[PDB]
Ligand SMILES: O=P(O)(O)OC[C@H]1O[C@H](OP(=O)(O)OP(=O)(O)O)[C@H](O)[C@@H]1O
Ligand SMILES: O=P(O)(O)OC[C@H]1O[C@H](OP(=O)(O)OP(=O)(O)O)[C@H](O)[C@@H]1O
Ligand SMILES: O=C(O)c1ccccc1Nc1ccccc1C(=O)O
Ligand SMILES: O=C(O)c1ccccc1Nc1ccccc1C(=O)O
């Protein structure tokens with residue numbers, strides 16, 4: 049096991065032997081990997097085309113070093129709403145808005161997230177501008193989830209030993225297999241999720257990883273390129289249920305949604321994006337609401353897949369009903385208020 | 395241009411635009427590229443499959459930054475005798491020996507190299523023989539004149555390559571950078587016998603030499619050697635007049651026995667050095683056979699600097715000249731004279 053061996057195999061376009069991807073990530077996280085080695089490995093794996101085995105190994109190492117939540121503190125049916133980012137469109141924070149709404153429908157949510165990478169305001173930037181605490185440690189994220197119905201795991205706080213890899217990722221400024229790893233390494237390990245993938249060529253592999261750990265996940269790619277379920281056109285969904293993956297194309301027109309234009313979903317700085325969260329939770333009708341409800345419903349469909357009695361059309365119809373109701377009743381707006389108060393009450 | 399633009403293009407499996415490889419390499423050469431960006435570019439260029447245009451851009455930037463030899467110092471017909479390396483097959487430095495013979499035959503040789511990554515490369519073997527390997531430009535120029543051979547130490551002549559060099563060692567896998575050695579001789583000889591281990595990159599290297607109108611034999615032993623092999627046939631890319639000919643070459647057409655890959659082995663600086671003195675001392679057998687044939691090849695490349703050069707008669711002249719330079723003790727005496735020069 050060594051860098052020349054592993055890098056040599058990748059550059060010869062061969063899949064890694066079992067344990068090699070794991071060995072490599074473990075080196076990255078114990079500080080025994082040079083930035084050049086980290087970059088070479090990220091790039092070579094990408095051009096070879098990563099397998100689910102390899103990417104699962106990498107995320108496995110990461111999770112094996114992540115700060116876990118206290119035992120018996122994350123409900124068996126908790127869901128995440130998170131994406132790779134890197135979609136190149138400056139959007140409002142559809143995942144963070146959908147998460148709030150999903151929690152308010154009564155589904156426990158433990159969202160993994162981070163500050164912006166290639167946009168003006170990431171999930172964490174926006175939650176912060178709203179007055180939500182993005183700085184909580186495990187014991188306090190667990191309390192948030194118990195008391196409020198939602199917790200936020202700020203990726204850097206829970207994965208401090210990934211710091212070198214995250215730096216190299218940003219130094220290279222080209223998407224690689226490493227861009228998959230955030231959504232795959234929520235430290236609370238929820239079993240369900242709506243998982244956005246910006247990179248169409250990698251979403252299948254991502255779904256393979258969720259499939260191996262028997263998650264109930266919808267891996268989503270907007271056909272306009274969004275790492276979210278889009279309203280401008282169709283979305284490609286890799287539906288992961290009972291250890292397998294099937295590829296579906298989803299059309300919001302089937303559920304009465306008008307086509308939107310990308311520029312209608314455009315976001316701004318943290319303050320702009322925060323005001324957009326408030327306008328949606330306050331009942332403002334239009335494109336942004338439609339996209340939040342659609343994404344919230346996809347998370348709820350994922351949640352329902354944990355039972356496997358679940359049927360695709362009734363699921364979506366229930367998801368939409370529940371998501372819209374959570375906004376309409378004020379539950380979602382009140383949930384955000386209660387989330388803010390919780391963090392201020394220490 | 396930018397790194398995100400260049401790296402994204404390479405990972406989507408596309409050839410670079412004109413001048414992007416030059417841009418990237420100039421960033422690397424001016425201390426402006428982070429190690430991660432160097433490594434990213436090196437790997438992605440390698441897995442995309444580099445073109446002759448791209449590799450020419452890279453080599454060009456290196457030569458722009460290289461310490462040159464003084465003007466009117468390098469004869470028009472100087473040759474190089476060199477390989478990419480990366481062979482894995484730890485053999486005696488056939489290049490270094492062939493080069494001494496070529497010089498002793500009266501063809502000016504200006505060579506170029508670093509110490510081995512592994513166990514004794516061009517530079518190492520030469521040091522064990524007593525040659526001063528890291529003379530500066532003026533002294534390499536005087537060596538070339540007075541001795542008929544000189545050696546340009548890569549860290550001495552390409553010292554802005556240090557950032558790329560660090561990354562090559564950390565990565566420890568062959569990349570496109572492994573190709574640049576034969577392509578970045580700071581004395582810029584126009585002729586050469588150029589060994590390439592990688593079979594799929596030999597033709598690219600040849601394309602680069604064709605662009606600069608070099609009279610070069612880029613050689614690949616159908617047995618994986620980065621020199622003309624006696625084990626089997628060889629693939630030669632004959633570069634002259636700016637065009638390439640891929641032909642297949644058999645030494646037995648000139649009367650060479652076959653050999654075993656094992657008979658060429660040797661690792662220690664002192665083991666390769668002793669094997670130099672032995673062949674130059676007239677020891678017959680497979681090592682000399684390989685030295686002579688590679689020396690002849692470099693002589694054939696030299697001859698191709700004249701348009702009216704015929705393949706078979708040129709090779710006959712080359713072998714005869716190479717054999718004679720050893721047999722008369724001319725090669726042995728040049729090496730002793732070389733050793734003595736650096737004093
Ligand atoms: O800056 P980018 O690389 O283009 O990615 C946008 C964001 O992707 C993640 O989104 P997440 O799904 O976690 O939250 P969101 O959709 O609510 O922003 C995280 O916020 C990234 O910063
Ligand atoms: O560890 P390696 O990468 O294999 O290095 C062996 C040498 O290959 C080249 O040698 P050159 O052709 O200049 O001389 P030689 O073939 O006689 O050894 C290059 O200068 C390397 O130092
Ligand atoms: O950014 C990522 O690729 C990432 C992916 C998964 C987990 C954490 C991640 N980021 C970090 C981790 C530790 C310190 C800083 C960061 C950072 O984002 O700057
Ligand atoms: O030799 C010089 O004075 C010199 C001048 C400028 C740049 C490099 C130089 N030499 C080296 C540098 C690094 C390692 C070995 C050497 C060497 O000469 O063996």
Ligand SMILES: O=C(O)c1ccccc1Nc1ccccc1C(=O)O
Nearest residue numbers: 508548549552553554555556559560
């Ligand atoms: O390290 C090498 O083998 C090397 C190879 C080619 C060019 C430069 C090189 N290194 C240097 C040369 C002069 C000064 C400093 C360095 C350095 O390593 O920082």
Ligand SMILES: O=C(O)c1ccccc1Nc1ccccc1C(=O)O
Nearest residue numbers: 477478506507508548552572575576
């Ligand atoms: O890649 C080779 O070993 C090589 C092969 C043939 C001639 C020279 C070579 N080396 C270099 C050339 C230019 C700059 C740095 C180097 C270096 O090795 O550090």
Ligand SMILES: [Mg+2]
Nearest residue numbers: 130131143244
């Ligand atoms: Mg998102």
Ligand SMILES: [Mg+2]
Nearest residue numbers: 131133275276
């Ligand atoms: Mg997004």
Ligand SMILES: [Mg+2]
Nearest residue numbers: 476477489589
């Ligand atoms: Mg050689």
